[PDB]
Amino acid sequence: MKVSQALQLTSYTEDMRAQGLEPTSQLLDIGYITADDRLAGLLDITAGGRVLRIERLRMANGEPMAIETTHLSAKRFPALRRSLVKYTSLYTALAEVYDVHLAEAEETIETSLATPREAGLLGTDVGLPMLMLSRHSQDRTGQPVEWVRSVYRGDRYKFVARLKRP
Amino acid sequence: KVSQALQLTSYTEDMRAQGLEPTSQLLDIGYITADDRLAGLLDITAGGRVLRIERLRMANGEPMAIETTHLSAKRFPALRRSLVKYTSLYTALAEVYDVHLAEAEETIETSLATPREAGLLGTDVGLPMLMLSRHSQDRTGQPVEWVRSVYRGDRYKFVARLKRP
Ligand SMILES: CC(=O)N[C@@H]1[C@@H](O)[C@H](O)[C@@H](COP(=O)(O)O)O[C@@H]1O
Ligand SMILES: CC(=O)N[C@@H]1[C@@H](O)[C@H](O)[C@@H](COP(=O)(O)O)O[C@H]1O
16 A cells, blocks of 8 residues: 655655646645755865755645655756746756766665654654655755755655665 | 664674674575566576575664565575574674675665564554665675665664775
């Protein structure tokens, strides 16, 4: 009953088309923030630097799946906020508008509980275990492009990884 | 929350990969009968004998996970004393049986702690847990193990390196 998601450097839009499900999104909030030392180091920008923050509800066939909050350097991508009016896929926007392509990412997987707001958005009981993911991605020139923190419904997701003995 | 890269390594290797000292407690070990599910996973006949091993995993002495391992009993004679000997299942597999893991599929999910798990892990019933399953095959292409582990949600995180094909 859970979606089985392969761990791979792919977009939510790509992932849902793999599942044969229709991906839609709801822009919960978008705008600029000032980076603290942590976010500055992750995006290789000067402390105090401006960060585009994008928060989206990701749905599969109209049902809430996850809330994703993505962070990118506003200085590098000043027209990206506006460009997302035209693109549903962030990765597609980066490729077509800025010729930026992701090459490597580190993804972290943890579990914890949703905030009251998240639980309301996802339609889950607030006591439901959730899958808390982060993704730190870099492009083909080795520059960090995004830092993403996400909350995936614990009752709808499992992740799958292929392991190899080195 | 302590980090741990997803790759085909043992608990022992992963712990020594950090500065953490791995210890385990053997909770139980015994034979069960395989249902169709397990029989398929281990490539034995339904009704076949499976060795189930239950271990408590500690990092620097603090309880971290309960790990339940399933293997074909017929394939691994004297596995119990061999596990006592080497402590690492993977070391035992290599040294005793000349069995070497080549590939595995790992599943990562959430769950809630059962009363048994909460008691063993010194935590609360209903604490969010990370539930990981590993299905591994050896260099002959044969499945070796099917493992299910429950990690304290407040103490563990798993890390994966992604690269675009
Ligand atoms: C790691 C994670 O939880 N989600 C990633 C996220 O890092 C990325 O920003 C998004 C872009 O999807 P889009 O191109 O469809 O907007 O795809 C994935 O879902
Ligand atoms: C959920 C999982 O992947 N558990 C793996 C398990 O499949 C594997 O049998 C175990 C081996 O460790 P050991 O040699 O006993 O120290 O390492 C665990 O981490």
